[PDB]
Paper text:
Multiple strategies have been developed to modify monoclonal antibodies, including chemical conjugation and protein engineering. Recently, we identified a cyclic, 12-amino-acid peptide that binds in a cavity formed by all four IgG domains of the cetuximab Fab. Owing to the location of the binding site within the Fab, we have termed the peptide a meditope (medi-, middle, + -tope, place). Based on our observations, the peptide–Fab interaction does not affect antigen binding. Herein, multiple crystal structures of meditope peptide derivatives incorporating natural and unnatural amino acids bound to the cetuximab Fab domain are presented.
Residue numbers in the entry:
A (entry chain E): 1 to 12
B (entry chain B): 1 to 134, 138 to 220
C (entry chain A): 1 to 213
Write the structure that this text describes.
């Protein structure tokens, strides 16, 4: 549901 | 065509300011406004502000105090500055242009500037080879980009000519506070004798630019 | 501000299937809504402007509908290249706000991983550290277990995994597990094994090497 800086993808 | 290219990724110490330059091409800053959007873990996509064709600026309510946007039309440059950053200001900052000069449907984006807010020091990585040895004519090889800060780091293979079979894993934060990632590629075993395999590592925050030749041990 | 609620959080479909994205606004915003696609390490890509209007260079399988508070983005025949996050943006009220997004995963047949183990380079050993890497390449689904053993001793707490997003072509994942030891520890042992458990494997696959050869 949160945005991950390491992939520019949503993770959790 | 239309392009927006931002300045390189940066580290900002707590309570200090962030500065980003958005250089545009394919259109004139006199005919279009440039918006600034950031993407953070805790707030996702967030509209920060805009500088219009005529020079006026609007800033989103939470940033009216520390946000400042300027531009140089002749140099096709827009200057983003935000003050007194904290940890939750760590995000990817984009400059963007809409379809029309007055609107907000962002059809053109910058590549994004990853901003890390940390008191830690910049640290260039070490690049180590992941050497193949002795899968049905397919050999895997790669590079280990270890112990760097902050993010990001770019990895390509053979100056961009090799993209098929490439996997660049997301960086993991080690207990030492430094990042580390690997980049792998699968190639025919028979090509390992007549082909050179180089990973092009570039850690812009530290000006570390390394080419690592990866051979069978 | 206007709160945009996207639903669901994660969508998982098969290629060729239909898929719709929900974006609900905290109040009526008419048709003033734009949709965005964002691939891994990419910037947002404008898909639809004003709920339903087409965008240049966007495949015809992308379309949007809705008005008031309930809006829909649809892909009639989804493809592997559509693996991304999808955001909606409203601009009927200042300031323009974005939704939280919907992740689009793609189902595909089970693929067993290709496993490769990499010893630490002699270059890194000079730094006083040994990194052993095990590569799980092109597999599906995402669930996988990596078990490290050093002279038949189960390793725990001294490894870290990293998993790629879904590949835009074959929709597979790849995983890297890095075992990290001190050089003194690494030189005190011989057999370094990586056991991989995955649904596509009838039995665990173990790649290993002996320090030296």
């Amino acid at each position: 549901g949160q945005x991950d800086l390491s992939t520019r993808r949503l993770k959790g | 065509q239309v392009q927006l290219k931002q300045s390189g990724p940066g580290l900002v110490q707590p309570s200090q300011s962030l500065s980003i330059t958005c250089t545009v091409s394919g259109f004139s800053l006199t005919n279009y406004g440039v918006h600034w959007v950031r993407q953070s873990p805790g707030k996702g996509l967030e509209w920060l502000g805009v500088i219009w064709s005529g020079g006026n600026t609007d800033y989103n309510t939470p940033f009216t105090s520390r946000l400042s946007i300027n531009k140089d039309n002749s140099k096709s440059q827009v200057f983003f500055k935000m003050n007194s950053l904290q940890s939750n200001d760590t995000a990817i900052y984009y400059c963007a242009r809409a379809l029309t000069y007055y609107d907000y449907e962002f059809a053109y984006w910058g590549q994004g500037t990853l901003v890390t807010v940390s008191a830690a020091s910049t640290k260039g990585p070490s690049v180590f080879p992941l050497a193949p040895s002795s899968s049905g004519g397919t050999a895997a090889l790669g590079c280990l980009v270890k112990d760097y800060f902050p993010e990001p780091v770019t990895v390509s293979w053979n100056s961009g000519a090799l993209t098929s079979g490439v996997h660049t894993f997301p960086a993991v934060l080690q207990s030492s506070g430094l990042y580390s990632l690997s980049s792998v590629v699968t190639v025919p075993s028979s090509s390992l004798g007549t082909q050179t395999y180089i990973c092009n590592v570039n850690h812009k925050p530290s000006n570390t630019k390394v080419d690592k030749r990866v051979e069978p041990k | 501000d206007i709160l945009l609620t996207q639903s669901p959080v994660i969508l998982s479909v098969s290629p060729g299937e239909r898929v719709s994205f929900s974006c609900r606004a905290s109040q009526s915003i008419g048709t003033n809504i734009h949709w965005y696609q964002q691939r891994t390490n990419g910037s947002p890509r404008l898909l639809i402007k004003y709920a339903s209007e087409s965008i240049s260079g966007i495949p015809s399988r992308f379309s949007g509908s809705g008005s008031g508070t309930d809006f829909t983005l649809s892909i009639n025949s989804v493809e592997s290249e559509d693996i991304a996050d999808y955001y909606c943006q409203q601009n009927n009220n200042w300031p323009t706000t974005f939704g939280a997004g919907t992740k689009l995963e793609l189902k595909r047949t089970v693929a067993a991983p290709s496993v490769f183990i990499f010893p630490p380079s002699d270059e890194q050993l000079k730094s006083g550290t040994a990194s052993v890497v095990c590569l799980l390449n092109n597999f599906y689904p995402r669930e996988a277990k990596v078990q490290w053993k050093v002279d038949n001793a189960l390793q725990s707490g001294n490894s870290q995994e990293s998993v790629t997003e879904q590949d835009s072509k074959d929709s597979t994942y790849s995983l890297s597990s890095t075992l990290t030891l001190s050089k003194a520890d690494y030189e005190k042992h011989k057999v370094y094994a990586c056991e991989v458990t995955h649904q596509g494997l009838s039995s665990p696959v173990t790649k290993s090497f002996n320090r030296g050869a």
